[PDB]
Structure 1
């Protein structure tokens, strides 16, 4: 029996097979020593005992507004944001570590960008049980697990007021770096780029980009419909878009991410960002009449990347966190720190971001209430209502609570089922192992995981042992913070991936973070003062209610 199946090495120690049946843990730089890296060094011990729980820190951050208001207007704001940035980031390996093919560092894992990386090695194929040495010989049926604990019965809105404007932003944004390859299989991605490169606007490959570009004034091709600007058609921009068989090219919109024609919300954002790109080109040309099409295009792209990182940290994440602390996007906060400006999307981060519970039972646009069947492959809704109308509608409709269980609409429950199946193919280690990998104590029972007893009893009967609970299921079934959109694990595990992805970008490095990179002071300020409201309203005829929070 493979000793590493027991996950003997603690605190990021590395389990290596030695001889026919022995194992050793490489505790290098873990802060611990001993056979299993559990004997702490004096400094390590002080840090671990003097640190408040994720639950207590969360409390401090969502209480005492009056105090935080004072803090948010001083340098303490910076000090804390930097603290948040470094502490969350150090939890992500960089250079990247393993991939679906190698549960060990290798030159292939480091140079081969078609692979998603992974934080914890896989469950060795030769282990007694699917999860290691705990649980039953066979995992609970994915389908059953989903219907029992993930299916929505009664719509549960997000207590934090998150809306569909946010939901679709999330779907739009994440899909620029989550593009699992159907051809290569699980564990592989076509979103080389691995981060905020805006590939969902410009395309994940040159040829597509060239087909999407006007090659005049650095602009992106487009078309006018009802006196409004929209992405061009595939006929004008011959690029592969995944539309239902039968829909003509002249009726398809070409945008960068092949999958965006399958939801008005997605194309909505495609339209907004496309309008913002061409707008920025105008501002740039005014500043540099001697610039060619290429430089105008390249420079505008860097600007939008900046705007995206800005808005994601200061509004998107802010919304999700519900923190009284005013999050801040300022690369300089890291100029005095040891930080690698690179990123590699992890398969776990992909699993974790499946926030389908956000989707509602139906989609309300003014007096009209559209169903999934009327909404999903709708090729006219966006143009019928226009950008302003849809933004207003999505900004008003509440999105569903992510954590807590039983809140995924039956229309898309199938995604969760496949997420669970893919997880087993990827052989993700147990939820508890990830709890530990991210600084939390493992759950000692299902009743501790869920703040209740009914689901816990059934889960325990199915899994047999809390140490067998799988990654994704653990994330969605964990008990949620007070009036939060999800549990602590979602944050403690997601923040590192997210923040490392945002700041790990090259435009955030000392070499790139300069006015000249963005065409000058005008371009640099577009990044620095970017805003959701401005992203929309500076590109629409009228300004509707725009926010990631319900009115």
Structure 2
């Protein structure tokens, strides 16, 4: 039998088949040696024995308010942020490694970017079981597993007080780089650029961008309604949008991300950013009167990418982490370090980001409470209430807890189901194996996994062996910290993926991080000082309560 099915190689060592039945682990640069890369090197042993547990670190980061307040105001802040930035990233490989077609390095894997990459090779198609060596011959019925462990029974709010403003941001944001090609199958992505390219505002292809663009003052096309500014209609911006048959082009808003029409929350953020883009153009023009359309546009896009990356690090991630340490966005922190300014979206990263539990039972907008069947495709609510109106409403309603289990609304539970199904087609490796990839002890029992005995008990009869527990279910059912939005694994695995994909951008490089790049000091500060509040209020008549945290 395929020896690599036993996943013999520890610590990032590579399992290669040799002869008819042998195998060898390439322990190059893994820090360990031996047949399976288990014998540590002197420095490696020290490092691994002198590293406080993930939970301990988390502890230190979420306590000592008085302490941090003092640290955050010194240089230690920067020092730690850099540590975080670097340490966390070195986990994600770059240049990227494998994809759904190759479980080994290949020039194509590195060239063909329609491919999502993956951190761990697939479970060899010829292993005794679906997960490799352990578990039953057939995995739990996807749907059952979902109804039994992910379906929300009673709404469980996120203890960290995260709101829908955050939720919808997360959705809007991720959908600029998570765009699975329906025409190519799983593992493929129409979101080339694999990162924060703001393709969800400008489009994933030129023609579409060109269509979305006004080609005057560098501005982006738009339309006026009730005296306010909203994205143009599909009749004026003949772009392709995914709306249900029966809705005329004059009722569809063209934005950059085809799917964004299927939720006011999305189209909301779409409007906000469009608004901003246009505004930045104005700013740039006052400064550079000799500039043409292209450059005004091109520059304005770089500024928004900067802003986006800023707001995500200092307010969005901050929100999630709940850290007392003040996260900081400063491309310079890495100028001394060894870092590759490029990113390649991983399928595992895609899985992990399905945060559907955030969605509420219903959507409250003031005295009015809207249902899914009232929200999901409402092509007027946005224009009816207005940007400010919604931002105030979404900032006040709490999002649901992500980790914990049984907290996904039925209206959208069908997704978590496909996520599991897709996982198997992608032949993702076992949860534990991924745990190790991200420097964590594998779980020994389902009862160590979940914080309890009853659910674990059932998961055990179903999966057979904790070592068969799949990637997504593991992330979503794993026990949660004291009162955090999710578990250890979610943080330990996701943080690397998110920090790398944030700093691994060309504008974060020393070659790009110049003021000239953003049209001078004016444009540069726009980035250096961007904030969720400003992003909203500097583009709306009134200023509502805006924040990722419910008041």
TM-score category (smaller protein): over 0.9
Distance across 2 between alignment mates of 1:263 and 1:11: 43
Shift in Å, 1:42: 0.4
Deviation per CA, 1:221-259: give whole Å up to 9, x if none: 000000000000000000000000110000000000000
Helix, strand or coil: the match of 1:416?
Answer: helix
Shift in Å, 1:440: 0.3
Helix, strand or coil: the match of 1:29?
Answer: coil
Distance across 2 between alignment mates of 1:521 and 1:545: 29
- Kindly report which structure 2 residues correspond to 1:60-459, keeping only aligned pairs within 5 A, or say none: 60-459=60-459
Distance across 2 between alignment mates of 1:260 and 1:466: 38
Distance across 2 between alignment mates of 1:488 and 1:535: 32
Shift in Å, 1:73: 0.2
Deviation per CA, 1:298-354: give whole Å up to 9, x if none: 000000000000000000000000000000000000000000000000000000000
Deviation per CA, 1:53-88: give whole Å up to 9, x if none: 110000000000000000000000000000000001
Distance across 2 between alignment mates of 1:447 and 1:200: 41
Distance across 2 between alignment mates of 1:523 and 1:545: 26
Shift in Å, 1:382: 0.1
Distance across 2 between alignment mates of 1:248 and 1:49: 64
Helix, strand or coil: the match of 1:103?
Answer: coil
Shift in Å, 1:292: 0.1
Deviation per CA, 1:365-416: give whole Å up to 9, x if none: 0000000000000000000000000000000000000000000000000000
Partner of 1:36: 36
Distance across 1 between alignment mates of 2:120 and 2:423: 13
Unaligned runs of 5+ in 1: none
Q: TM-score, normalised by structure 1?
A: 1.00
Shift in Å, 1:92: 0.4
Distance across 2 between alignment mates of 1:515 and 1:258: 33
Deviation per CA, 1:245-292: give whole Å up to 9, x if none: 110000000000000000000000000000000000000000000000
Deviation per CA, 1:440-487: give whole Å up to 9, x if none: 000000000001001000000000000000000000000000010000
Helix, strand or coil: the match of 2:279?
Answer: helix
Helix, strand or coil: the match of 1:259?
Answer: helix
Distance across 1 between alignment mates of 2:46 and 2:217: 58
Distance across 2 between alignment mates of 1:525 and 1:302: 13
Helix, strand or coil: the match of 2:258?
Answer: coil
Deviation per CA, 1:119-168: give whole Å up to 9, x if none: 00000000000000000000000000000000000000000000000000
Distance across 1 between alignment mates of 2:117 and 2:246: 37
Shift in Å, 1:109: 0.1
Helix, strand or coil: the match of 1:536?
Answer: helix
Distance across 1 between alignment mates of 2:308 and 2:67: 30
Shift in Å, 1:294: 0.1
Distance across 1 between alignment mates of 2:406 and 2:57: 28
Deviation per CA, 1:12-58: give whole Å up to 9, x if none: 00000000000000000000000000000000000001001110000
Partner of 1:19: 19
Deviation per CA, 1:408-433: give whole Å up to 9, x if none: 00000000000000000000000000
Tell me, yes or no, if structure 1 residue 465 matches structure 2 residue 471: no
Partner of 1:516: 516
Distance across 2 between alignment mates of 1:440 and 1:83: 19
Distance across 2 between alignment mates of 1:85 and 1:198: 22
Helix, strand or coil: the match of 2:229?
Answer: strand
Distance across 1 between alignment mates of 2:440 and 2:520: 45
TM-align CA RMSD: 0.2
Helix, strand or coil: the match of 1:68?
Answer: helix
Q: TM-score, normalised by structure 2?
A: 1.00
Distance across 2 between alignment mates of 1:58 and 1:112: 38
Distance across 2 between alignment mates of 1:402 and 1:43: 38
Unaligned runs of 5+ in 2: none
- Kindly report which structure 2 residues correspond to 1:478-489, keeping only aligned pairs within 5 A, or say none: 478-489=478-489
Distance across 2 between alignment mates of 1:85 and 1:20: 43
Helix, strand or coil: the match of 2:410?
Answer: coil
Distance across 2 between alignment mates of 1:308 and 1:276: 11
Distance across 2 between alignment mates of 1:200 and 1:390: 20
Shift in Å, 1:193: 0.5
Deviation per CA, 1:151-197: give whole Å up to 9, x if none: 00000000000000000000000000000000000000000010000
Distance across 2 between alignment mates of 1:141 and 1:18: 36
